[PDB]
Amino acid sequence: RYSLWDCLWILAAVAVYFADVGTDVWLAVDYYLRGQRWWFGLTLFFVVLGSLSVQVFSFRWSFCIWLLQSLIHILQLGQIWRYFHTIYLGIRSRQSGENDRWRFYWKMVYEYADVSMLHLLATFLESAPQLVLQLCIIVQTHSLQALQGFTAAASLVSLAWALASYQKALRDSRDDKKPISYMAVIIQFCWHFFTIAARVITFALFASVFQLYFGIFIVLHWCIMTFWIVHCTKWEEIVFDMVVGIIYIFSWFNVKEGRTRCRLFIYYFVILLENTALSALWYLYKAPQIADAFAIPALCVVFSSFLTGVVFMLMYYAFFH
Numbered sequence: 001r002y003s004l005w006d007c008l009w010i011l012a013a014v015a016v017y018f019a020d021v022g023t024d025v026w027l028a029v030d031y032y033l034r035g036q037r038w039w040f041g042l043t044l045f046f047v048v049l050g051s052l053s054v055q056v057f058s059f060r061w062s063f064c065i066w067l068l069q070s071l072i073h074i075l076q077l078g079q080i081w082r083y084f085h086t087i088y089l090g091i092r093s094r095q096s097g098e099n100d101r102w103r104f105y106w107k108m109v110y111e112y113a114d115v116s117m118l119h120l121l122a123t124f125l126e127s128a129p130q131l132v133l134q135l136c137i138i139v140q141t142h143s144l145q146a147l148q149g150f151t152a153a154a155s156l157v158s159l160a161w162a163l164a165s166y167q168k169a170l171r172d173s174r175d176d177k178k179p180i181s182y183m184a185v186i187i188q189f190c191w192h193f194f195t196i197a198a199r200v201i202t203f204a205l206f207a208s209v210f211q212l213y214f215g216i217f218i219v220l221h222w223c224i225m226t227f228w229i230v231h232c233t234k235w236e237e238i239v240f241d242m243v244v245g246i247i248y249i250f251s252w253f254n255v256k257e258g259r260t261r262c263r264l265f266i267y268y269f270v271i272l273l274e275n276t277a278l279s280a281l282w283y284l285y286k287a288p289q290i291a292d293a294f295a296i297p298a299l300c301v302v303f304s305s306f307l308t309g310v311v312f313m314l315m316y317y318a319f320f321h
Contacts, residue, residue: 002105004090009182010112013165014083017119020158021051023151024130042133050126054079054118061114079122082115113173116165123162128250131155131196135204136211142290156200160193163251177256180320187316194309196250198275198302205298206278209285221249221274232263268310275306 024047031040058078059071073081086108093105134152138144164185171180180188207214226245230238247253252267254260279299286295 003094004105004108005094006182007087007090010083010087010090013119013161014080016158016161017079017083017122020123020127020154021047023147023154024050024126026147027151029147039137043130046126046130046133050122050130053125054122057121058082058114058118079115079118082111082118086111086115109173113169116162116169120162120166123159124247124250127155127158127162128196128200131159132200132203132207135200136207139204139208156193156197159196159250160189163192164189167254184316184320187312187319191309191312191316192251194305194312195252195271196309198306198309199250199271201302201305202275202278205282205302209278209282217274217278218249222246224270225249232257272306275302279303 024043027040027043027047030036030043055074055078059074070081089108089111090105093108097104131152134148134155138148138152167188168180168185171177203214206217222245225248226242229241229244229248244253244255248267252264255263257263279302283295283299286292292298
């Protein structure tokens with residue numbers, strides 16, 4: 001019920017977030033040793049947006065010295081400050097503090113919910129565009145340096161970890177809704193990781209094939225998902241539905257809403273149909289120039305990863321109850 005002991009997994013969230021941002025900013029090679037104006041500009045823009053939106057939202061939520069210290073700490077590493085503040089609140093609750101339930105450790109749960117929400121925002125403003133852009137660059141110019149691969153993997157693990165952690169916080173920071181344990185959080189992270197991996201690989205392949213049609217596809221998918229969600233606090237509901245529609249481009253937001261099997265099946269069918277269409281079109285439009293006889297593994301790995309992601313999702317869905 002209380003007295004948190006597994007703070008190591010919360011510390012691992014700090015490691016994952018810092019690894020993501022550090023690997024993303026390590027792409028200064030695209031401007032210093034391997035100077036590329038477009039790639040450096042895109043990566044820097046994504047990193048700046050992801051690391052400034054979260055900072056602004058954290059600032060938007062004891063003399064003037066403390067105010068200045070917290071302001072500087074925000075401006076530099078606000079998200080990591082939130083993580084270590086969560087750790088400190090948990091430690092203080094464990095040590096003592098048998099006061100009213102006002103601030104016993106619900107302060108820690110509130111802080112964890114806020115930091116997971118900020119992590120999700122940063123992961124869908126920085127990690128997802130960074131991952132897709134890096135995959136598109138890898139497939140556009142076939143030079144998969146270990147730095148690019150590690151940065152893409154860091155963005156992917158940040159995205160999947162953000163999804164799993166947000167689901168944990170949502171199941172944690174409210175009454176009822178039985179809390180989800182790390183044994184299920186890791187499985188959800190794995191299925192998000194694999195499904196998003198397949199999705200972004202297909203996105204990169206179809207982008208290299210015809211990015212002009214890929215942009216129309218992405219806006220059409222966002223519009224369709226937004227319309228589906230609004231089909232299922234006056235304009236704030238519409239804004240939240242549009243945000244969930246943006247989330248639906250890559251992964252599945254997992255709105256419980258009672259029965260969810262039908263919506264999950266429809267979303268999986270839509271994404272599988274889109275991925276199959278993109279893979280088939282790219283394969284039909286990859287023969288000229290470089291006729292890759294090894295492109296068959298390049299399409300089989302995507303479908304194997306997608307199948308493993310679906311299998312992990314089914315395993316979590318079945319074993320949670």
